[PDB]
Amino acid sequence: ISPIFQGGSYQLNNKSIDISSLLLDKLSGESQTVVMKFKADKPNSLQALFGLSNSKAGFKNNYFSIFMRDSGEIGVEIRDAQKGINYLFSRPASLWGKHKGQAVENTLVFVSDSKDKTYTMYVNGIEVFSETVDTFLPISNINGIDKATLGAVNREGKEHYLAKGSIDEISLFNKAISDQEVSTIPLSNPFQLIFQSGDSTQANYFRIPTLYTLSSGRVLSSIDARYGGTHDSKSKINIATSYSDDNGKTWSEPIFAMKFNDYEEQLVYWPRDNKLKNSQISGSASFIDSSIVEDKKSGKTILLADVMPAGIGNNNANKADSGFKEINGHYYLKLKKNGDNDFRYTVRENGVVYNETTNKPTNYTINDKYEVLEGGKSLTVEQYSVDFDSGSLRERHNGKQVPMNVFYKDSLFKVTPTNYIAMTTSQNRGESWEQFKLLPPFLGEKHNGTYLCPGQGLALKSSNRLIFATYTSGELTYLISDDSGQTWKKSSASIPFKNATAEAQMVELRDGVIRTFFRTTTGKIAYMTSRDSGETWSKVSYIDGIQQTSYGTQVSAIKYSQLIDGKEAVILSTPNSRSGRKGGQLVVGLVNKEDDSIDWKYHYDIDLPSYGYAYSAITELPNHHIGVLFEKYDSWSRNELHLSNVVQYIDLEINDLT
Ligand SMILES: CC(=O)N[C@H]1[C@H]([C@H](O)[C@H](O)CO)OC(C(=O)O)=C[C@@H]1O
Question: What ranges cover the BNR repeats?
Answer without folding.
Answer: 242-253, 424-435, 479-490, 528-539
